[PDB]
PDB file of C-alpha atoms in Angstrom:
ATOM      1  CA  UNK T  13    -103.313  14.905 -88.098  1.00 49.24           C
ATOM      2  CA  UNK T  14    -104.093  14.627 -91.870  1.00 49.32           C
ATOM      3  CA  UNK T  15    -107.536  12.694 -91.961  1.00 49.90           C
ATOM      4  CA  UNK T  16    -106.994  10.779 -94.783  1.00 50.54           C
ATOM      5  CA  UNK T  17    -105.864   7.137 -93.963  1.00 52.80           C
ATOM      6  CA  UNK T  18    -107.015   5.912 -97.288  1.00 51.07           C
ATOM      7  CA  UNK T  19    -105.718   7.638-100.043  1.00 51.09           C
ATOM      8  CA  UNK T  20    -104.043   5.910-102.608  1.00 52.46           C
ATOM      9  CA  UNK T  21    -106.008   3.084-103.874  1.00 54.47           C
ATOM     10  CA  UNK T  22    -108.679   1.816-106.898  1.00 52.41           C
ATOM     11  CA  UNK T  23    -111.486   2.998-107.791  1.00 52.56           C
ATOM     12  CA  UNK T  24    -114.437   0.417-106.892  1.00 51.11           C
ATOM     13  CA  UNK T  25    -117.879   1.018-107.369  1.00 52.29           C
ATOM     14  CA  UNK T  26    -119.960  -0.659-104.567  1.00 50.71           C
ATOM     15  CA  UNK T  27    -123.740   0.149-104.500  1.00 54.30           C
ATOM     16  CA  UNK T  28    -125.128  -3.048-103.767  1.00 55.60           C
ATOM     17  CA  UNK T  29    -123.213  -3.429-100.393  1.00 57.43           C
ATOM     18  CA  UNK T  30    -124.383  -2.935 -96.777  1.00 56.43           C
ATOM     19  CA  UNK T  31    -121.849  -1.577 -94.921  1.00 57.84           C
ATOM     20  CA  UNK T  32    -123.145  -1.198 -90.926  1.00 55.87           C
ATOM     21  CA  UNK T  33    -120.987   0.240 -87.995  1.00 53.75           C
ATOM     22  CA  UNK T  34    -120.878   0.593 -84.201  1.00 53.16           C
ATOM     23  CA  UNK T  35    -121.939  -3.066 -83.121  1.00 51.96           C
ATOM     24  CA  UNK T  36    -121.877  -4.550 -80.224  1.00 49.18           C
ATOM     25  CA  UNK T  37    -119.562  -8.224 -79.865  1.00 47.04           C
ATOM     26  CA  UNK T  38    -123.217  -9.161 -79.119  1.00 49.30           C
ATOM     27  CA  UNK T  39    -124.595  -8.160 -82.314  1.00 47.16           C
ATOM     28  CA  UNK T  40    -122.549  -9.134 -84.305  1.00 47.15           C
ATOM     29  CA  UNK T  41    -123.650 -12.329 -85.478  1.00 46.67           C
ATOM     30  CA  UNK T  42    -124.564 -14.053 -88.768  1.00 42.12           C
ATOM     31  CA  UNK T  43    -128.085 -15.201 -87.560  1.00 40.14           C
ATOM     32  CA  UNK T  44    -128.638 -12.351 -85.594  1.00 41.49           C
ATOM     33  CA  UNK T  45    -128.494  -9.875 -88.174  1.00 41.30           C
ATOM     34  CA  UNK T  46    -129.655 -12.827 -91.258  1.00 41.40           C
ATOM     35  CA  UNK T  47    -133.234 -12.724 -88.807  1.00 43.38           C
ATOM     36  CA  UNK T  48    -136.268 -10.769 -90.319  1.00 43.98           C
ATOM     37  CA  UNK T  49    -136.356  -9.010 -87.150  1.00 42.62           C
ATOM     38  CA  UNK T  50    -132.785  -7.139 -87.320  1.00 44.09           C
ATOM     39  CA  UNK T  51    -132.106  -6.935 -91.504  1.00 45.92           C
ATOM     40  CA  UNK T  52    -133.637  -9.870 -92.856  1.00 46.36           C
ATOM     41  CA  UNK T  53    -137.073  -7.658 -92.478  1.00 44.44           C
ATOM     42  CA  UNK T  54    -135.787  -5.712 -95.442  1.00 45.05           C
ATOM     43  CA  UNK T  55    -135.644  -9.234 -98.066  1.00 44.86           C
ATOM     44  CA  UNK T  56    -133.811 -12.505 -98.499  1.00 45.75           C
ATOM     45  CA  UNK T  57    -129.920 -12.119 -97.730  1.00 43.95           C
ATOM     46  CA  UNK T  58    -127.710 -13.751 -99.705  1.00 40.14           C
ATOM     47  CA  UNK T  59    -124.295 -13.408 -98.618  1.00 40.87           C
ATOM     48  CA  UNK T  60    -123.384 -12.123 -94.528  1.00 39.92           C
ATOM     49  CA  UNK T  61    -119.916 -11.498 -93.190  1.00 39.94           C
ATOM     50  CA  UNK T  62    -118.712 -10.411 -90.138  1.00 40.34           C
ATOM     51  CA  UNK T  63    -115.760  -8.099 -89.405  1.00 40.99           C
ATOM     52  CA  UNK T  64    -114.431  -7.647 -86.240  1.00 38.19           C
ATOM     53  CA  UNK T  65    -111.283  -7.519 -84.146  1.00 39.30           C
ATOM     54  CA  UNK T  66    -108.522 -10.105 -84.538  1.00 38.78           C
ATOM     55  CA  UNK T  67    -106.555  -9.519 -81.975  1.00 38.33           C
ATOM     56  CA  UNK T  68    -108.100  -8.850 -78.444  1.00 40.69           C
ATOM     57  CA  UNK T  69    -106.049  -7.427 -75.543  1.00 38.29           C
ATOM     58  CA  UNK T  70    -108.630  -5.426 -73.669  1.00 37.28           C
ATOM     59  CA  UNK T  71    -106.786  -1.992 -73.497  1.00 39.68           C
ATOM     60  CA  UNK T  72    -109.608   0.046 -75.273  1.00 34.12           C
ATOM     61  CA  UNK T  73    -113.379  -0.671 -76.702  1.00 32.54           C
ATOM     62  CA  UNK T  74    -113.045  -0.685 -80.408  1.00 31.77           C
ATOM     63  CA  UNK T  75    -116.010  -1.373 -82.685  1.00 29.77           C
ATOM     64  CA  UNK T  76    -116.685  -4.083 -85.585  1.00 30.37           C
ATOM     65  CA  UNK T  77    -118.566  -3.799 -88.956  1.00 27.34           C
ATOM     66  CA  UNK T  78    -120.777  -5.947 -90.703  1.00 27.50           C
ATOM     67  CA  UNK T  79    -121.153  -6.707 -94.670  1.00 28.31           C
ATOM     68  CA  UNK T  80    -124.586  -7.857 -95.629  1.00 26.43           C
ATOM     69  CA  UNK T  81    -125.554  -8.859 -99.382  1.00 29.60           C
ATOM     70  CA  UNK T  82    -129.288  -7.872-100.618  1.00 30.78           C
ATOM     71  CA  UNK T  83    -129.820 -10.408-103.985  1.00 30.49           C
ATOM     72  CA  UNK T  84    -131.899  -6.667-104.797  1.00 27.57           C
ATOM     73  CA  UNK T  85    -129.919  -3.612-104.921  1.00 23.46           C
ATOM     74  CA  UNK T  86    -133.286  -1.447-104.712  1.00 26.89           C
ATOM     75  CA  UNK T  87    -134.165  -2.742-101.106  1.00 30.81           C
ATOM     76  CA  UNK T  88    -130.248  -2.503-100.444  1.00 32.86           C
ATOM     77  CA  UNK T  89    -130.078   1.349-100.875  1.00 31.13           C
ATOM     78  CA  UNK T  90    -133.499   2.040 -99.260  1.00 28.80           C
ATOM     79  CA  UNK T  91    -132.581  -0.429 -96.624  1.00 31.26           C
ATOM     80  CA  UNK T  92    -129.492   1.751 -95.746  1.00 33.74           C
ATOM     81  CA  UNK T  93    -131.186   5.052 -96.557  1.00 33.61           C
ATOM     82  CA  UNK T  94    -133.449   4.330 -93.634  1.00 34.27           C
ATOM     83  CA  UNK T  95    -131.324   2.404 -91.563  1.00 30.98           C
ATOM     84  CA  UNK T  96    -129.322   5.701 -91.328  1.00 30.19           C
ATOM     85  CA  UNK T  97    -130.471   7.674 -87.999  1.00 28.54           C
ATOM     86  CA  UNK T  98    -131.210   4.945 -86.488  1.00 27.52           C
ATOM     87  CA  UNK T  99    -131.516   3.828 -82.817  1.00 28.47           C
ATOM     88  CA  UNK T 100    -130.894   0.227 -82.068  1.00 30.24           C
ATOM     89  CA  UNK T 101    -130.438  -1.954 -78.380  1.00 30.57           C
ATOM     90  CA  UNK T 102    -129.704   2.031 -77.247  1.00 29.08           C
ATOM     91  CA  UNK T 103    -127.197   2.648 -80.383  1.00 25.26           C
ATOM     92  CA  UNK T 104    -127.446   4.501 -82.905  1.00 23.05           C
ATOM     93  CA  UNK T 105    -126.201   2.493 -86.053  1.00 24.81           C
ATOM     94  CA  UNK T 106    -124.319   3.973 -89.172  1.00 26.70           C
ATOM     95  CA  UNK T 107    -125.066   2.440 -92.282  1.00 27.51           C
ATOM     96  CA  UNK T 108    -123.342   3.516 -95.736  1.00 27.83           C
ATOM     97  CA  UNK T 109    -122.241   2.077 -99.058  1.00 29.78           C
ATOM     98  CA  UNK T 110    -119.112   2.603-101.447  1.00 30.40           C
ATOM     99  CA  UNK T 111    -116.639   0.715 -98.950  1.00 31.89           C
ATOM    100  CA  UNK T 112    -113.522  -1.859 -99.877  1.00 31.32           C
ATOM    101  CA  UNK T 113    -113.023  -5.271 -98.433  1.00 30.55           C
ATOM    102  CA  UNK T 114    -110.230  -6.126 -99.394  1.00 32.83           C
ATOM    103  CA  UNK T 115    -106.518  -4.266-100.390  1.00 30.43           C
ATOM    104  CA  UNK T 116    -105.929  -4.301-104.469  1.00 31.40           C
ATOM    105  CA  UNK T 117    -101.741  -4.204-103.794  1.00 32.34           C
ATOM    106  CA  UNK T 118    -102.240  -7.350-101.900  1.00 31.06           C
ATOM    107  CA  UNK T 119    -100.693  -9.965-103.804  1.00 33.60           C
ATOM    108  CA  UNK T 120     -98.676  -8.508-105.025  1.00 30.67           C
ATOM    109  CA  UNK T 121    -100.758  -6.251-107.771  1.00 25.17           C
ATOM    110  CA  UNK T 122     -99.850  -3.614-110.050  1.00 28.22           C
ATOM    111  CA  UNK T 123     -97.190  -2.808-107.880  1.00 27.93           C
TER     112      UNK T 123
END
């Protein structure tokens, strides 16, 4: 098909945001991931929220994402920079930055 889902939208600049992939129902938790064993290690976090599936059926195994805040944008990038390639509980995580949260038209909005 024509890989581009998200096309028309604003331009938002988000460096300072840890955007993580491919975890488990398991792993995704707030004090899980806040512990200075999973992401904490990296510093203090300040802000951690948790997206996953809304609606559960159990027809396929989707995956959730995870938004953690770093009060210091230096050990956010490096965090993810090394994060990347990595092998965790048997899976390999994705980290990246430069992702939206939210939809601007929602509101309505300069629409």
């Amino acid at each position: 098909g024509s890989s581009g889902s998200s096309g028309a939208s604003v331009r938002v600049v988000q460096k300072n945001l840890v955007f993580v992939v491919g975890l488990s129902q398991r792993l995704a938790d707030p004090e899980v991931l806040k512990r200075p064993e999973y992401f904490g290690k990296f510093g203090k976090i300040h802000k951690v929220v948790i997206n996953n599936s809304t609606s559960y059926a159990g027809s396929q195994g989707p995956s959730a994402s995870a938004y953690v805040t770093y009060i210091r944008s230096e050990d956010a990038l490096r965090a993810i920079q090394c994060v990347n390639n990595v092998v965790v509980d048997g899976r390999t995580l994705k980290a990246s930055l430069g992702t939206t949260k939210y939809c601007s038209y929602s509101g309505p909005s300069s629409g």
